[PDB]
Amino acid sequence: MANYFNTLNLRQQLAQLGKCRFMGRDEFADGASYLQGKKVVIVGCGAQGLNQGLNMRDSGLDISYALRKEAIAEKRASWRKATENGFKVGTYEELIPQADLVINLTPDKQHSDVVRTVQPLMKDGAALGYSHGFNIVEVGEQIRKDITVVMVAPKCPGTEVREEYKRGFGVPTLIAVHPENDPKGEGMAIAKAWAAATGGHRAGVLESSFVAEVKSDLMGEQTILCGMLQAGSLLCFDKLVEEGTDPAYAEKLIQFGWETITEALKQGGITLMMDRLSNPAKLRAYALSEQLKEIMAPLFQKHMDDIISGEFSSGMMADWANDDKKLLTWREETGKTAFETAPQYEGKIGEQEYFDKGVLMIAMVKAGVELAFETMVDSGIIEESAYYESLHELPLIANTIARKRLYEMNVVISDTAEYGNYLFSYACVPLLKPFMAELQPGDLGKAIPEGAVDNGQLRDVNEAIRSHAIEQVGKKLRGYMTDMKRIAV
Amino acid sequence: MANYFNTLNLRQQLAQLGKCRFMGRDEFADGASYLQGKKVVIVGCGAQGLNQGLNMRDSGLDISYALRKEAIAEKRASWRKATENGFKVGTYEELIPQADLVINLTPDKQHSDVVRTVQPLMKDGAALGYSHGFNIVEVGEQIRKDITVVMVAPKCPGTEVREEYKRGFGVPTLIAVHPENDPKGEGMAIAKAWAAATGGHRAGVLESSFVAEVKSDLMGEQTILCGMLQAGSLLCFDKLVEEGTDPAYAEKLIQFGWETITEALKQGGITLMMDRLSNPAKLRAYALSEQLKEIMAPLFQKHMDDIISGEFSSGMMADWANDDKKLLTWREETGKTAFETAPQYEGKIGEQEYFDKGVLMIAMVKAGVELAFETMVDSGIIEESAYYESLHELPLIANTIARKRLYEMNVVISDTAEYGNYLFSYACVPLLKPFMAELQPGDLGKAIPEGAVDNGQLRDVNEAIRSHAIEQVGKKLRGYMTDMKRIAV
Amino acid sequence: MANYFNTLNLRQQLAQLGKCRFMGRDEFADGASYLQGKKVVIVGCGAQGLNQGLNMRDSGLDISYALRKEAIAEKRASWRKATENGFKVGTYEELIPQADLVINLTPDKQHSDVVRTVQPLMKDGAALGYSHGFNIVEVGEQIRKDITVVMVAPKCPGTEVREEYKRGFGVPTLIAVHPENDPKGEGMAIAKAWAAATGGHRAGVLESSFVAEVKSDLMGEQTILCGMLQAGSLLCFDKLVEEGTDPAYAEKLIQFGWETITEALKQGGITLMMDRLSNPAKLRAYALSEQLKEIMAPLFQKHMDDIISGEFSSGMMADWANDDKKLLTWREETGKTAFETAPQYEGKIGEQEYFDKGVLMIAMVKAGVELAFETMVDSGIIEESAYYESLHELPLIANTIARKRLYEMNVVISDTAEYGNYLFSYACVPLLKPFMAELQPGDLGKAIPEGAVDNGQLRDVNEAIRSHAIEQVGKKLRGYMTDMKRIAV
Amino acid sequence: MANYFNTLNLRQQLAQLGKCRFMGRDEFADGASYLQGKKVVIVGCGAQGLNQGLNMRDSGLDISYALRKEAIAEKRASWRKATENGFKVGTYEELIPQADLVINLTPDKQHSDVVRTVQPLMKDGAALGYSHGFNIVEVGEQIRKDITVVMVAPKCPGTEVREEYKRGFGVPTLIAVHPENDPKGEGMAIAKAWAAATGGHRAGVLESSFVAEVKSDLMGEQTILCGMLQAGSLLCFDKLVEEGTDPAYAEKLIQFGWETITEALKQGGITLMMDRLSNPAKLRAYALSEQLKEIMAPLFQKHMDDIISGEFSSGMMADWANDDKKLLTWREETGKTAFETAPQYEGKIGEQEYFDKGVLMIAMVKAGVELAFETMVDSGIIEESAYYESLHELPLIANTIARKRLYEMNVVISDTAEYGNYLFSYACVPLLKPFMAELQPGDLGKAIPEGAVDNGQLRDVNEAIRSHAIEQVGKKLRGYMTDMKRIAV
Ligand SMILES: NC(=O)C1=CN([C@@H]2O[C@H](COP(=O)(O)OP(=O)(O)OC[C@H]3O[C@@H](n4cnc5c(N)ncnc54)[C@H](OP(=O)(O)O)[C@@H]3O)[C@@H](O)[C@H]2O)C=CC1
Ligand SMILES: [Mg+2]
Ligand SMILES: [Mg+2]
Ligand SMILES: [Mg+2]
Ligand SMILES: [Mg+2]
Ligand SMILES: [Mg+2]
Ligand SMILES: [Mg+2]
Ligand SMILES: [Mg+2]
Ligand SMILES: [Mg+2]
Numbered sequence A, B, C, D: 001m002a003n004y005f006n007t008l009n010l011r012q013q014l015a016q017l018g019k020c021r022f023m024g025r026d027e028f029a030d031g032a033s034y035l036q037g038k039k040v041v042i043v044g045c046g047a048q049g050l051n052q053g054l055n056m057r058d059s060g061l062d063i064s065y066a067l068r069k070e071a072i073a074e075k076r077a078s079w080r081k082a083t084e085n086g087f088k089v090g091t092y093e094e095l096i097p098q099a100d101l102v103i104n105l106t107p108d109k110q111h112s113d114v115v116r117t118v119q120p121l122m123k124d125g126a127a128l129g130y131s132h133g134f135n136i137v138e139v140g141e142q143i144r145k146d147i148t149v150v151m152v153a154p155k156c157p158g159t160e161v162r163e164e165y166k167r168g169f170g171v172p173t174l175i176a177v178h179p180e181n182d183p184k185g186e187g188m189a190i191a192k193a194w195a196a197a198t199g200g201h202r203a204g205v206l207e208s209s210f211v212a213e214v215k216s217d218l219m220g221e222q223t224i225l226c227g228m229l230q231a232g233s234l235l236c237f238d239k240l241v242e243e244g245t246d247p248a249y250a251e252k253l254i255q256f257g258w259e260t261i262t263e264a265l266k267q268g269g270i271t272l273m274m275d276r277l278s279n280p281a282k283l284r285a286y287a288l289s290e291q292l293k294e295i296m297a298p299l300f301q302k303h304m305d306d307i308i309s310g311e312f313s314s315g316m317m318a319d320w321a322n323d324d325k326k327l328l329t330w331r332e333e334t335g336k337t338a339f340e341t342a343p344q345y346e347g348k349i350g351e352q353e354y355f356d357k358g359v360l361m362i363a364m365v366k367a368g369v370e371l372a373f374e375t376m377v378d379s380g381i382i383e384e385s386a387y388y389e390s391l392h393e394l395p396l397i398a399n400t401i402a403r404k405r406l407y408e409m410n411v412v413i414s415d416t417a418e419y420g421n422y423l424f425s426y427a428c429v430p431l432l433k434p435f436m437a438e439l440q441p442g443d444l445g446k447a448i449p450e451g452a453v454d455n456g457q458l459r460d461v462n463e464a465i466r467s468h469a470i471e472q473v474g475k476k477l478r479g480y481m482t483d484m485k486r487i488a489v
Helices: A010-017 A047-058 A069-073 A077-084 A092-098 A108-121 A134-139 A158-166 A187-198 A210-242 A247-275 A279-309 A311-321 A325-336 A351-356 A359-377 A383-388 A391-412 A415-431 A433-437 A455-466 A469-487 B010-017 B047-058 B069-073 B077-084 B092-098 B108-121 B134-139 B158-166 B187-198 B210-242 B247-275 B279-309 B311-321 B325-335 B351-356 B359-377 B383-388 B391-412 B415-431 B433-437 B455-466 B469-488 C010-017 C047-058 C069-073 C077-084 C092-098 C108-121 C134-139 C158-166 C187-198 C210-242 C247-275 C279-309 C311-321 C325-336 C351-356 C359-377 C383-388 C391-412 C415-431 C433-437 C455-466 C469-487 D010-017 D047-058 D069-073 D077-084 D092-098 D108-121 D134-139 D158-166 D187-198 D210-242 D247-275 D279-309 D311-321 D325-335 D351-356 D359-377 D383-388 D391-412 D415-431 D433-437 D455-466 D469-488
Strands: A039-043 A062-067 A088-091 A101-104 A127-130 A148-154 A173-177 A205-207 B039-043 B062-067 B088-091 B101-104 B127-130 B148-154 B173-177 B205-207 C039-043 C062-067 C088-091 C101-104 C127-130 C148-154 C173-177 C205-207 D039-043 D062-067 D088-091 D101-104 D127-130 D148-154 D173-177 D205-207
Touching: A010 A210, A010 D010, A010 D279, A039 A047, A039 A092, A047 A062, A047 A077, A047 A158, A047 A187, A062 A069, A062 A077, A062 A092, A069 A077, A069 A088, A077 A088, A088 A092, A092 A108, A101 A108, A101 A187, A108 A127, A108 A134, A108 A415, A127 A187, A134 A210, A134 A311, A148 A187, A148 A210, A173 A187, A173 A210, A187 A205, A205 A383, A210 A247, A210 A279, A210 A311, A210 A359, A210 A383, A210 A391, A210 A415, A210 A433, A247 A279, A247 A351, A247 A359, A247 A391, A247 A455, A247 A469, A247 B455, A279 A311, A279 A359, A279 A415, A279 A433, A279 A455, A279 D010, A311 A325, A311 A415, A325 A391, A325 A415, A359 A383, A359 A391, A359 A469, A383 A391, A383 A469, A391 A415, A391 A469, A415 A433, A455 B247, B010 B210, B010 C010, B010 C279, B039 B047, B039 B092, B047 B062, B047 B077, B047 B148, B047 B158, B047 B187, B062 B069, B062 B077, B062 B092, B069 B077, B069 B088, B077 B088, B088 B092, B092 B108, B101 B108, B101 B187, B108 B127, B108 B134, B108 B415, B127 B187, B134 B210, B134 B311, B148 B187, B148 B210, B173 B187, B173 B210, B187 B205, B205 B383, B210 B247, B210 B279, B210 B311, B210 B359, B210 B383, B210 B391, B210 B415, B210 B433, B247 B279, B247 B351, B247 B359, B247 B391, B247 B455, B247 B469, B279 B311, B279 B359, B279 B415, B279 B433, B279 B455, B279 C010, B311 B325, B311 B415, B325 B391, B325 B415, B359 B383, B359 B391, B359 B469, B383 B391, B383 B469, B391 B415, B391 B469, B415 B433, B455 B469, C010 C210, C039 C047, C039 C092, C047 C062, C047 C077, C047 C158, C047 C187, C062 C069, C062 C077, C062 C092, C069 C077, C069 C088, C077 C088, C088 C092, C092 C108, C101 C108, C101 C187, C108 C127, C108 C134, C108 C415, C127 C187, C134 C210, C134 C311, C148 C187, C148 C210, C173 C187, C173 C210, C187 C205, C205 C383, C210 C247, C210 C279, C210 C311, C210 C359, C210 C383, C210 C391, C210 C415, C210 C433, C247 C279, C247 C351, C247 C359, C247 C391, C247 C455, C247 C469, C247 D455, C279 C311, C279 C359, C279 C415, C279 C433, C279 C455, C311 C325, C311 C415, C325 C391, C325 C415, C359 C383, C359 C391, C359 C469, C383 C391, C383 C469, C391 C415, C391 C469, C415 C433, C455 D247, D010 D210, D039 D047, D039 D092, D047 D062, D047 D077, D047 D148, D047 D158, D047 D187, D062 D069, D062 D077, D062 D092, D069 D077, D069 D088, D077 D088, D088 D092, D092 D108, D101 D108, D101 D187, D108 D127, D108 D134, D108 D415, D127 D187, D134 D210, D134 D311, D148 D187, D148 D210, D173 D187, D173 D210, D187 D205, D205 D383, D210 D247, D210 D279, D210 D311, D210 D359, D210 D383, D210 D391, D210 D415, D210 D433, D247 D279, D247 D351, D247 D359, D247 D391, D247 D455, D247 D469, D279 D311, D279 D359, D279 D415, D279 D433, D279 D455, D311 D325, D311 D415, D325 D391, D325 D415, D359 D383, D359 D391, D359 D469, D383 D391, D383 D469, D391 D415, D391 D469, D415 D433, D455 D469
Parallel strands: A039 A062, A039 A101, A062 A088, A101 A127, A127 A148, A173 A205, B039 B062, B039 B101, B062 B088, B101 B127, B127 B148, B173 B205, C039 C062, C039 C101, C062 C088, C101 C127, C127 C148, C173 C205, D039 D062, D039 D101, D062 D088, D101 D127, D127 D148, D173 D205
Antiparallel strands: A148 A173, B148 B173, C148 C173, D148 D173
16 A cells, blocks of 8 residues: 555656646536436545535435444434434445445545445445545555546535535535546546535635645644644743743733634735734734744755655554554643643733734744745645645634644644644744744733834835735635625625 | 917827836937937026036036026026036027027926027927926927927936936936927937936836826826825814914924825835824724815816816916916915914924824825826826826925925925915815814824724725725836836946 | 717716726626516617517516507507517507606617607606617717616627527627716616626626717727728729629629628637738738728728717718708719629639638728727727727628628618718728729739748738737637637537 | 755755746846956867857956867867967866866766866866756766856857857856855856856846756757657658658658748747648648647656656666667667668759648647647746757757758767657657558648638637747747847847
8 A cells, every 4th residue: 555646756746736726616517417316425424424415415416324333323423413414324235335426524544444345335437535635645545446536625614614505605625536546537527516516616616636635734734734833832832931921821822812813814814914013013023934934944844845755644654553652642741731731811811912912923823824835835736725725724723722722723633633733843842942042022922012113124024925925825815715705695 | 379288189189198108228228329429408507407417418418508698697506507517608699509409498487488589599400308398288389390399307306316327327207209390200319318318217217298298297286296285284284283282393293294204105105104004093094085085086186177178277377477466375375374384393203203193194195196196097197107296206395395394395396386286275275174173083193092903994905005006006116116226226 | 959978078088988897797696686676668669679678578577668659550560579579568658657767779860859758758766778879979868867877788689689698698788877867876787787687798798888889889880890891892893893803703702702701800800810811811911901001090080080079970960950961862872883783793702712812801801990999999998899899890790791782781780870981981982092003913803822921021910910909809808708608508 | 976866855856847037137237247357267179168268258258278188289179279269278287276167068978077087176166167967967976065066058059159149149048056066155146157258148048957957958859859850750751752752852851841840930939830831731730739749648758757767867878888889779770761861852842842741740840849848847847948948949950950861960969869869769650650651641741722711710729829838938938039139239
């Protein structure tokens, strides 16, 4: 079971790495029709499985859920959810053999066990679907030649997928067809119909590839999404305490800061997030970010490089086979950090206060997101892909920390993201120690007084921020999506 | 002699009004060589005359000054300056008859008397140069058919055209050829060489026309440049005083405020000027500006329309023929004004304070500048011309007020600009009275406190500011010009 | 009843002349809804009236036809067509008083008589609709203040309007709202709904103005569409005969040539039409076109100028009031020309033969269409407008000539177009006499031998053709429309 | 010494492969001044060496030639040429030790022996220049760390770089700095001054890299430039003969056909080359080209992949070490070929006849050029590089065949290009056998008659031709270069 990406030569790798194309609304004229009157069987009934299923049934598709025998006998939540929503439910043996499309909506770490049990039961020329590409790409799962393999990957959790669909809208979605498995050349038609049936074509669909989705997803989560938020949380909390800030106040500042500042990010990219600062604070935030980018570039590059080479996934899967020893160890250490155990301040912290007292947090967001984006683009990944696996997802991850700290983040995300996070975090914390030691008053925990700044410098900083390539694609893609949302009224 | 613009039909008017083309560097490969070995004679040795002459001689041209006999006999400053700097000086009869190029650098109000005295002395196929097109366009001066008529109009005062040249640089420059007077088709060759001899091709040269230059200049100066600064100065000082501001402090606020805020405008357009405010102050300046634009639009449109139709210049020239009765009456009334007679505070007003306490002033600049620009573009004038006759020139006019108040502005500018100012200002002041009566705290004379603002609103305001056509063309032009500067130095 | 365009000042004229905006498909989300449950009454039941009505009824609107009392009593075709299609039919008195939208679909020359009879019967706040703007713009018809005046103008004859609608598609359409008559500000909503109900939003809708539609329509028909085709037909037929070509063969060459060559024009603009020639023939066609453009420019300019000034329509309406004396005289002379009376060749003329024997015809098409376009754009009209009133309409007019010669063209088109045609034709024929006298072998009636040409010249000619502004907007607009058609499948 | 490209990971490879930036004129403001007062020593006085040296001395640089002692003693042409032209000439020991810049202008196959002999003589911090990057990239030559390593690669033969310079012009030029050897960060300064001293900045200079230059050069030469011309020459001559064409006439058709059709390619890209055909012939060349591309794509991709992986150059260098056994065997077999031994017709073949009777040849140029370009761009090479190593260079290679057939091409080009050619050609010939067997009349050796073609099809073919990425970038680059020429002359 060799890593699939590694069986490809440079030209072949680039061809897939660079696959990303925001699709025309027109391209989905046939809607879900191609799948009408065919048997669609979802494996598992979890977050994505139930919610994609609800949407697809509403779109006219025949959906049923294949569960393990013991899931049915034990009345697992999956079986209860499926049956209470009036779906047909059965065993692999009763449902897989007739299925035209088998949709694998189980946790990624489990995909080998699932695919290997399900394939032999699938009829000739049936299609196998994934919502994430790790199994095909990193594991190198071999799919029987006559089977068509496709991906439809919503960029939101299942509940949002269902909710947006109900209100006549939907969620941005990525699609792909695995070229080793498109024997009848119907991959795209199946994927487009599946995507349309979940409502994706209402919000924007990107034609991509298993390889691009996987490589960019891993880079984003390891560096900016989880790695940086964890490293940043520990560094900043420790620094605040070390400089005399009340621990409970420091813990709340950090717990809710990322969420507050990334909400400006969600609304208008790095540009708006920086704009919420006073002018002198913006200039300082910009400079801190530049120093951060310079210090962290080799680390971000190492991560992209290991992701590309297969060294990342190979190393992690060795931990999987050794009972997640390293994961569990790092998770335990994480749960013992001062920030994770700190008491939480009780009084109010005003919205602007998170910005003004979090100059360094803003700079860490900017530096990490730009570095992740640049390093991906430098590795053959297209801007749009890099954007969706970095800046786009940041606010949601910030939300989890707000809910229940690093603990909540690390249980909400996949084992792959968690492991990825620790690998980065435990390198990045030591790395930034000298840097943290030289912070200046105003950098963290105290507002930098608004006031006069040099006209030229202000102009140059504003221009440097908004002209960053991630701000340009961001402004464009958010523009598309806003337009789509408006149309759906 | 009839207004020249009015002898043209719509198509012909449009062809002229819309002439404006930023010229390529390579169009000046010949430099000043077309004028080498030729006799260039400048009439009147004043601000433009001496300084353009200095540059042209340094560029290898043969430059002499033709003065009136009494100017020589009385040793006027013009005669002093020319002979001091080692130029040949003579009477019209001595120098004009052999002139290949006669450059008229006397005040615009005097052009008819100058042109009608110099024409009969000019040899066959000579050329007549202007640096402003009022005499040709509005007066309708008729120029002997064998004479070629061209314009080279630096966009900066004489002292600056000299010092930039000495620095190996130059000043943005407009050129034009009057199509009724180009019998050899050599107008453009003459104009380009004259412009290059002054150093304009080192900065940027625009191919324009007598008509576009005049109509846009008149509109910029009477609305945004002088009218709005005069109307705004009076309105704001009176309102500061009315609401309890110490008069001497109010007068300093207004006297130096325009210069301080437009320094930002100079460096980075309306964008940078607004960026200097706190976020809540910015949102409020933007709103005030929109209200202002709505209220002033009919007045601005009236001024453009009267400029287009010739009603403005005919009305003004009737005043010329009536011993400037209206001009002088308006000038006197301006001198008895509260702002013009107020004591001046000698104490300190910090740079940021002019922005923070001048929210309404900033809104007036934005509104006036945008409105003038829009109204011009709606009248067949190209963006670049509209930009150069409004936003570009505003910082210099603000500097005059900083020096010696409205008195200084009205004596520094031409009688045409001054009359235009009053005509506008005396209508705009009463027009805005209800508006001033409804100002809220923070609008003028007191800072609006920095703080939180809605994310979306801030994003949208920032986008609306920088996406304005005057901001887009301004960012482009300042770009070209900044690039050229780096080459030259 | 003063010409409306002439009551406007330059800025006001340009604002309307330049109104042209291909609209977003999204802008028509409400479809015909705004008119649902309102009373729509069409006046007349002719070509546009019946076919727009059929479409609008199918779209859910309440359509009825108001006829003159005697049209009903005499059982005119209008009454028969309306009733056989099951429409409600009545007198002005019975239908107008309750109408929410009265749609004037009578011949333009008749509009004063119609509007003046219908207005007094229209309730307060009702809307009056036109499909052509001549009445409002040139005649200056005054519409009661409370009435909303809008235009919806399909760019195809009624039958095509109905036919394209039936097959789920439609026809490119122009809309406008007369600013003197939009008291409730509902003009655009009414016009958009009317346009959508006829199917226009399926093919492309342009937001324009009465003034732009009228001025560009008149220029197109007078010069390239009818004027040039008539002048060209007479010049070429006479030249062929004069040089020995069999008259019957010459008459067929000319009768069917325009149609054949403009079919390439319809498919791919001037670019494709020229591409159908051999290389040497293309180079010659290009050169002839350049000479033509130079000879004809003053004439095309005169026509645009008279159209703009109101001199065209004023002069024509003086003929109207003098019983169309000049029209009838020119029409009679036209019917006596050699081409109009020539016998028609019986044998076959191959498709390529029309191209190869019609080098001069191709050059006349190119020169006339480019000149009409350039002259319109020079007069404040937007490219898209100029395109739709010139190149776009050429093939249809070529078709009429093919059917039944100049006679057919001049009876198919409005009296306004016919008069316009003669005014141009009778100037253009004499004008081109010297030019026709110097034609070379191959220019007309004989193929120019295919073969070698200079590489550079060929490149330059190809580039000069396809880079013409009319070829750029053409390629773009045909691209939009093709896309729209594809979507409608 | 290991292949340098292979020591890099994907990200690092991509950074190099994708380096290509057309440089601004202003980047060369300093001209050659960075090298003034320095000692420049060229090793080997051959085609590039003498001619670059002539330009550099004229540009004010201090140029001397370092020859082997035996070259001086034996009075080789190199020694003759240098002393004839008045240059200092010495041994390595005399000139190298004080050299600031040692420019290696010996044949690429000899670079290892040259570099390893010259390095030990070079003083500390000296610079080593190449004009092709094979030694650094593929051989992996290791250069003393204190030595700066740069490349200046004119895109034209030496005689042309000399004569363009004399004309005040120059030749498009690639520059690069090897990142493993830039200890003072002065590489770019050295490279830019050397390029300017040769006159490259007068035409156009691209900032590229050793890696991009090598990989693209190798790919262009073995597929389109030499391989395709050799495979095409043999295939076409044999098919002409097989089908009854007189052999001597067939050999002239092929010998001079490539040069004649690529003259059009030189002047205006594939666009102009296709335009020279009749419409029906054009449609057929286009179709043949598409079929060819489909058939050859795996072969082209194989060549790129082997070039990327190092398999090509390692395979070739094993042949170098085996006394060029494969090269010589392929060379000999090429000489016994029917085309190479055919008699030559002395009679006339008209220019247009090479196009008309060479439809297949034109299709082969189109297909090969596009395929090579596409395959390179798919491999991380930028369009501009891909353009300059294929289409740009094709006319010159065609000229060699016109002179003395495949014999002349294979002796004029390097051993690397020749070996690359054979490796490709001997696979492509048998590959295309079934294709040649199914040719239709008109495909080769006889004109396809001009005539009518479907309008839409012609439009679409013309669009597909000119919209190809190689045509778009080609039109842009030839534009820049044409503009620069006009300035210089
Ligand atoms: N034709 C075209 O290609 C296009 C035309 N248009 C516009 O559409 C409008 C209608 O044109 P079209 O359909 O050709 O018109 P028609 O010639 O087909 O109109 C026929 C109808 O108009 C009625 N009519 C004529 N004169 C009067 C009058 N004096 N009073 C009352 N009714 C009268 C006739 O009444 P009755 O039945 O009693 O005889 C008849 O019912 C025009 O403004 C035209 O410019 C717009 C786009 C394309
Ligand atoms: Mg992700
Ligand atoms: Mg993920
Ligand atoms: Mg001015
Ligand atoms: Mg002025
Ligand atoms: Mg028309
Ligand atoms: Mg018409
Ligand atoms: Mg090459
Ligand atoms: Mg080479």
